[PDB]
Amino acid sequence: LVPRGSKTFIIGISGVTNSGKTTLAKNLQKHLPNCSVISQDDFFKPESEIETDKNGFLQYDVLEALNMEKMMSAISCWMESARHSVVSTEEIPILIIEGFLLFNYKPLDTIWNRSYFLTIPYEECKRRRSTRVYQPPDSPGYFDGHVWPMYLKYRQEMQDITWEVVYLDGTKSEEDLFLQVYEDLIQEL
Ligand SMILES: NC(=O)c1ccc[n+]([C@@H]2O[C@H](CO)[C@@H](O)[C@H]2O)c1
């Protein structure tokens, strides 16, 4: 027999800011066995390593703002743990990686067994963004001056993507999105 324990199923949830990515990941995780979640936002660099543009906007919404080597190390640590998560006697451990900037990171371009992408239009995204507090906070004009233009850059970067993505309407309710993804996912596992 082919030894078990080495298989994993990795799900990517990306999408624009404030589109429900973290909540979706957590709702899926509550309904999937032996499932972990890694969040991209846990890997931002310290503000001293973050550059500022001509107009004084901090450059957070770009891969250079993230310690992606550290995030890879976290993925690898999950994989090591996953190999011991099922006692020997297939139950395939699940990882959900969720973050606003995943699908343009080339070292991970072959990791994704399923990929979802949450979308919300400009107006509602801006509204939702204004309800959240970041550290540091959004400066005046930050949405138009940085967040949205960087999101558009990301979407254009994804124009030549080498795997399939399922795009989701992030204006749908949390339960609606959970059920849609769960219905898809349980056919892929
Ligand atoms: N998590 C952070 O330290 C941080 C700092 C400044 C801005 N952000 C915003 O987080 C979003 C990703 O969820 C990006 O759009 C950043 O602007 C995060």
Distance CA 7, CA 174 (A): 30
Which entry of 41, 53, 169, 176 is annotated as an active-site residue? 41
Residue 72: what residue type? M
Burial of 157 (0-12, 13-18, 19+ CB in 10 A): middle
Ligand 1 neighbours by CB, cut-off 6 Å: 17, 41, 44, 60-61, 100, 134-135, 147
- Which has the closest alpha carbon to 78: 29, 8, 27? 8
41 catalytic residue (yes or no): yes
Residues just before a chain gap in the chain (C–N exceeding 2.5 Å) are 89
Residue 85 Cα to ligand 1 middle (Å): 32
Residue 115 Cα to ligand 1 middle (Å): 21
- Which has the closest alpha carbon to 177: 29, 36, 25, 24? 24
The per-residue DSSP string of the chain comes to -PPPS---EEEEEEESTTSSHHHHHHHHHHTSTTEEEEEGGGGBPPGGGS-B-TTS-B--SSGGGB-HHHHHHHHHHHHHHHTTSS-------EEEEE-TT-TT-GGGTTT-SEEEEEE--HHHHHHHHHHS--SSPPPTTHIIIIIHHHHHHHHHHGGG-SS--EEEETTS-HHHHHHHHHHHHTTT-
* β-bridge pairing 35-39 and 114-119: unpaired
Distance CA 148, CA 125 (A): 9
Count CB atoms within 10 A of the CB of residue 8: 17
Domains identified in the chain and CATH numbers: 1-189 (3.40.50.300)
Longest CA pairwise span in the chain (Å): 62
> What tokens were used for 20?
């429900």
Planar angle of CA 171, 184, 7, nearest 5 degrees = 125
Burial of 45 (0-12, 13-18, 19+ CB in 10 A): middle
Experimental method: X-ray
